[PDB]
Amino acid sequence: METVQDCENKLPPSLKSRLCEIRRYEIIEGPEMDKHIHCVMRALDFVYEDGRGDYHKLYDPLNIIELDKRHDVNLEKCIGECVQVPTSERAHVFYKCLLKSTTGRTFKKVFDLMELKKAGKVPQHQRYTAEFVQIMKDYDKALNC
């Protein structure tokens, strides 16, 4: 429905100048950030309305790129935490927690892939390849990043 691009188009002036930090997965505290990240996590279909992580949107994608028993653990852990916080902070807390975990490495790849898939820049079965990395680099560079 509403693209990650659409969320970057609401960024309060304070945040718009730090777009490259955000798109680099650097952490910045809200609730300006709290509600942009809920925008993007919702746009890529990773969270519910209340902003809770969807285990089932991530488990298979994470494991296809890097097969690791840790994804299950991290997903359970991070969903746990996003549940004990308020619904304006929740999507952002699940995001943050994942990136800190050992699933961070692969979550970033799944996130990048889903962003470009949804934008129609890469096909649906696109894998995290050397070509894909360059595709994202050029994508980011068109955004001044």
Are the CB atoms for 103 and 62 separated by under 8 Å? Answer: yes
Domain total of the chain: 1
To one decimal place, what's the resolution in Å?
2.0
CB atoms within 10 A of CB 93: 23
User: Does the annotation flag 115 for ligand binding?
Assistant: yes
CATH (domain of 131): 1.10.238.20
- Please report where in the chains the tokens 């996003």 appear, as a residue: 82
Q: What backbone torsions phi and psi does residue 79 show, to the nearest 5 degrees?
A: -60, -40
User: Does the annotation flag 36 for ligand binding?
Assistant: yes
Alpha-carbon span 91 to 107, nearest angstrom:
14
Q: Which domain holds residue 59?
A: 1-145
Alpha-carbon span 19 to 23, nearest angstrom:
6
Cα angle at 90 between 124 and 49, to 5 degrees? Answer: 55
User: Does the annotation flag 125 for ligand binding?
Assistant: no
Are the CB atoms for 134 and 141 separated by under 8 Å? Answer: no
Q: Which two tokens mark 105?
A: 């490495």
User: Does the annotation flag 21 for ligand binding?
Assistant: no
User: Does the annotation flag 55 for ligand binding?
Assistant: no
User: Does the annotation flag 24 for ligand binding?
Assistant: no
